[PDB]
Nucleic acid binder design. Structure first.
Ligand code: 1RZ
Ligand code: MG
Lengths: 549, 391
DNA sequence: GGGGGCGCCCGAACAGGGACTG
DNA sequence: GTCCCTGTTCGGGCGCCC
């Protein structure tokens, strides 16, 4: 039945007109499914036969559903979509079972032929013209394939449920498209009474709730999960098992793993993700690197284990704990009571040419905080593998504002640490290296080198280089040629900026080499001076490396 | 009857995504909005309205009352197109006159640009969308449209209290006097009664001059730091010089070698110390350009800032000290600096914040207490200028 | 062979600051 | 100015939901 809900007014984008795109061949099997659907819809007013008054046309097809018993009629409105006005999507995210609170009674209802029970704006119907190849119809209800259909449905649904929500403040209705989870703290008799009231309410507005898709007993099938009374489980995840992997099949693999990591702790996708780098198209085959095929195997082992998650109790604390997985990879577990996860997850985003473990930890914390706020509407307390004093040192020597919410240290290696610490004051009995580099923008030739207060000097010629590079190379040279304690004077804000933020990881091989050196040293002090102002003996090394460039 | 309002030419309305809110804030927002909806000030709308603007809520001081805050910065950027004595007053008081705006209806064809969306915890529901029917708090059009009515309400109070300066900026009324505190406060309450019927001290504010080390022995390193600092500062004060100090560094010396200061290098260091105690010459505030604010973290709860419109042409330079939570302190710093700007030039600065974007966005609304919100951008402070403004 | 949402990873485009040419 | 390097956005795959 069609809802007596007011239609939602919709326009084409200006200066534009409906699609005139011609039907495409269709399987004999599909055509019967379509006619069967269309003579039914047409009978019910869902669609109206049109004549030659209607210039427009858009192509229709059909795919078979999960029920493996009914067809889904689709329209490729890709052209009408581009010409249709913008909507503000009202679906802001995806509900998560970990954010559900324990309920005495629970129901899951599906709405029947949901879209086709919501009327489409009358002045807009004409553009939805379609042809069922051997009749010509238009839509009077929302079409599956049009881009306005989801927001108009979700929004319409919210209007319809609002009276019921107001009247029944303490019944919880999770509303994802046409699918409803209904929770109550009523005993099963009184709850079933409310469900019937909710179904009569829906029916009045033309939305049916077929018993076939009305679930009354645990476990409930909801949003890709199985909901048991005291625990939830993700419906089983099956990873592919090829020998030849394409980009498209790495990309589908990474996806299931990421999906999996919401409840399977430890999942890692760095080595797999890196294979995707540089590739040209989906067709492409890539050879699993030995670290990639290794990583894949560990994940495979992880997924073989049995895991569940629990529901949320607002009278307890939210605890998040994080583990360092190496290489800019992190897993976390959110819980309230020990060894009973609410949910898990991973952070692995590489932000920055150069960074270190404390920064990456701070980003993981920030990602988890935002995610906790979506799911539970509050921030969790943290358990982190980083000493209070490591953090305090970092916050003291980093020139940026940084902060981690309430947290406590957990001694679960590998601990997050700073791998070296530049001196705040120059070093007595340390040789002073004045470094520098220049490069010729046209030839791409350069020189890097130093001069020291003890009379040493050295110039290294470079090819296909850049001024920044030569400046990093000079610092690498002073580090290579110095003792365990070294004073380095540079004129490069560039170089000084990277090294002073204390990276332990970098995209740059040269910066990595530098880092390796900085870790070996006992003491390094890095100072800056303005270039080309005759400051000795920045001046002296400037002549050495400028010569010939 | 309604004042027509338009967008700047060739600009569409805001389309900014709502960010996630805490349970507390959503509860406040839903409570506030349902009653605003019952008073006719906002209307539920659908998704065919393509526009959006973020909302949240701050709860004040010691209270149990929240204030909605629509982040109208984008809409204000796209909306169609100051008492010098205010910065002298011994006390300045700041009142929230936002409620006044809901008495004036809003141009029908403009309402759609004021759309906002309320999120649900764990996305239990799609967002709930509203638009305004009256002058929205935080829109730049609101004080403009309501100005005429505002002048008429203050008029008797102003006449009878000639030595009280009252300034309006957005939802705010700045009220300054030279009265003793108590007589000042009794006056403020006189005005609230007056408005019902229908603390700042801009003396204390002081500039933070650039500083030069003074000490009895200098090492090569000390002098190298000094020459680098002075070289930078000479972009602000062209009267700074560094030739004599730099000739002490001739050769290739150890950083910790002690360099005795020659007579002229002692002298040149003396001038510089004085050239720094001058005002920056030739800086003229221009309203056609944004105020720009830089903030540098100096550690130990110390924050330095400069306000300018063109590089090295500072209008003000200052310091902000606190008691530790960097993000909070930074958010407090930003409010104090904005406050000063509104009081001094009647405009809001654009901030260059020394913080990571996600770090700031994750937490800044936990510490926000103003009814306006300044433009900002995030930058990584080159560690050098951190040294330049150093304590 | 269609849609909207969120997530993840990637590369492309573009913005902004520093260093350089003479 | 140009070139270099770094950050951000944003659109393209894929995952999952309906
Ligand atoms: N791949 C999909 C799935 C759903 N939809 C939309 C959004 S939810 C809405 C549901 O329509 P139906 O009533 O035909 O749902 P189903 O076929 O799932 O169960 P029935 O109730 O048996 O009819 O269809 C879509 O455009 N594309
Ligand atoms: Mg259904």
């Amino acid at each position: 039945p069609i809802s007596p809900i007011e239609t939602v007014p919709v326009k084409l984008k200006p200066g534009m007109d409906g699609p005139k795109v011609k039907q495409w061949p269709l399987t004999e099997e599909k055509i019967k499914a379509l006619v069967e659907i269309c003579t039914e819809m047409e009978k019910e007013g869902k669609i109206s036969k049109i004549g030659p008054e209607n210039p427009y046309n858009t192509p229709v097809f059909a795919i078979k559903k999960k029920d493996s018993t009914k067809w889904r009629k689709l329209v490729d409105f890709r052209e009408l979509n581009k010409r249709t006005q913008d909507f503000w999507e009202v679906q802001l995210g995806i509900p998560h079972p970990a954010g559900l609170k324990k309920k005495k009674s629970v129901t899951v209802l599906d709405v029947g032929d949901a879209y086709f029970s919501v009327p489409l704006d009358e002045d807009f119907r004409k553009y939805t013209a379609f042809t069922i190849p051997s009749i010509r119809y238009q839509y009077n209800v929302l079409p599956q394939g049009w881009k306005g259909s989801p927001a108009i449905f979700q929004s319409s649904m919210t209007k319809i449920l609002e009276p019921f929500r107001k009247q029944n403040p303490d019944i919880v209705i999770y509303q994802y498209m046409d699918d409803l989870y209904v929770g109550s703290d009523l005993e099963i008799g009184q709850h079933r009474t409310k469900i019937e009231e909710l179904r009569q309410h829906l029916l009045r507005w033309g939305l049916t709730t077929p018993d076939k898709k009305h679930q009354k007993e645990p476990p409930f099938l909801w949003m890709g999960y199985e909901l048991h009374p005291d625990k939830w489980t993700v419906q089983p995840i099956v990873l592919p098992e090829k020998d030849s992997w394409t980009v498209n099949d790495i990309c589908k693999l990474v996806g299931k793993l990421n999906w999996a990591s919401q409840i399977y702790p430890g999942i890692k996708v760095r080595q797999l993700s890196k294979l995707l780098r540089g590739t040209k198209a989906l067709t492409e085959v890539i050879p699993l690197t030995e670290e990639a095929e290794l990583e894949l195997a560990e994940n495979r082992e992880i997924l073989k284990e049995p895991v569940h998650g629990v529901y949320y109790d607002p009278s307890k604390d939210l605890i998040a704990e994080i583990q360092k997985q190496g290489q800019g990879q992190w897993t976390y577990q959110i819980y309230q009571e020990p060894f009973k996860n609410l949910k898990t997850g991973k952070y692995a985003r590489m932000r920055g040419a150069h960074t270190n473990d404390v920064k990456q930890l701070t980003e993981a914390v920030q990602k988890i905080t935002t995610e906790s706020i979506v799911i539970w509407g509050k921030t969790p307390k943290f358990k982190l593998p980083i000493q209070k004093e490591t953090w305090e040192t970092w916050w003291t020597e980093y020139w940026q504002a940084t902060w981690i919410p309430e947290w406590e240290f957990v001694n679960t290696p590998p601990l997050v640490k700073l791998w070296y610490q530049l001196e705040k004051e120059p070093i007595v009995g340390a040789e002073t290296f004045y470094v520098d580099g220049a490069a010729n923008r046209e030839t791409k030739l350069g020189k890097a080198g130093y001069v020291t207060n003890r009379g040493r000097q050295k110039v290294v010629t470079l090819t296909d280089t850049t001024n920044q590079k030569t400046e990093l190379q000079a610092i690498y040279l002073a580090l290579q040629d110095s003792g365990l304690e070294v004073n380095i004077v540079t004129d490069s804000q560039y170089a000084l900026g990277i090294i002073q933020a204390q990276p332990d990881q970098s995209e740059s091989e040269l910066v990595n080499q530098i880092i390796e050196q900085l870790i070996k040293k006992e003491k390094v002090y890095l100072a800056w001076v303005p270039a080309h102002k005759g400051i000795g003996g920045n001046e002296q090394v400037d002549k050495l490396v400028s010569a010939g460039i | 009857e309604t004042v027509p309002v338009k967008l700047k030419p060739g600009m569409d309305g805001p389309k900014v995504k709502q960010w996630p809110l805490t349970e507390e804030k959503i509860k406040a927002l839903v409570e506030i909005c349902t009653e605003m909806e019952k008073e006719g000030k906002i209307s539920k709308i659908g998704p065919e309205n393509p526009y959006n603007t973020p909302v949240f809520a701050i709860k004040k001081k010691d209270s149990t009352k929240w204030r909605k805050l629509v982040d109208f910065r984008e809409l204000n950027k796209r909306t169609q197109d100051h008492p010098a004595g205010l910065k002298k007053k011994k006390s300045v008081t700041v009142l929230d006159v936002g409620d006044a705006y809901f008495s004036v209806p809003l141009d029908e064809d403009f309402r759609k640009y004021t759309a906002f969306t309320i999120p649900s915890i764990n996305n239990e529901t799609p967002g709930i969308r509203y638009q305004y029917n009256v002058l929205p708090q935080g829109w730049k059009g609101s004080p403009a449209i309501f100005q005429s009515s505002m002048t008429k309400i203050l008029e008797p109070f102003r006449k009878q209290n000639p030595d009280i300066v009252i300034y309006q900026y957005m939802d705010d009324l700045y009220v300054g006097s030279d009265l003793e505190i108590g007589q000042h406060r009794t006056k403020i309450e006189e005005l609230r009664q007056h408005l019902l019927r229908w603390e700042l001290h801009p003396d204390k504010w002081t500039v933070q001059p650039i500083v030069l080390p003074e000490k009895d022995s200098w090492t090569v390193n000390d002098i190298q730091k000094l020459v680098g600092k002075l070289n930078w500062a000479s972009q602000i004060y062209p009267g700074i010089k560094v030739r004599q100090l730099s000739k002490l560094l001739r050769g290739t010396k150890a950083l910790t070698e002690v360099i005795p200061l020659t007579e002229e290098a002692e002298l040149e260091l003396a001038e510089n110390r004085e050239i720094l105690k001058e005002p920056v010459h030739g800086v003229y505030y221009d309203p056609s350009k944004d105020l720009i604010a830089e903030i540098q973290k100096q550690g130990q709860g110390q924050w330095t800032y400069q306000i300018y419109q063109e590089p090295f042409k500072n209008l003000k330079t200052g310091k902000y000290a606190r008691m530790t939570n960097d993000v909070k302190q930074l958010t407090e710093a930003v409010q104090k600096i904005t406050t000063e700007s509104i009081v001094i030039w009647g405009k809001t600065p654009k901030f260059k914040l020394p913080i990571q974007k996600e770090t700031w966005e994750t937490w800044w609304t936990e510490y926000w207490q103003a009814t306006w919100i300044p433009e900002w951008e995030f930058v990584n402070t080159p560690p050098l200028v951190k040294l330049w403004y150093q304590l």
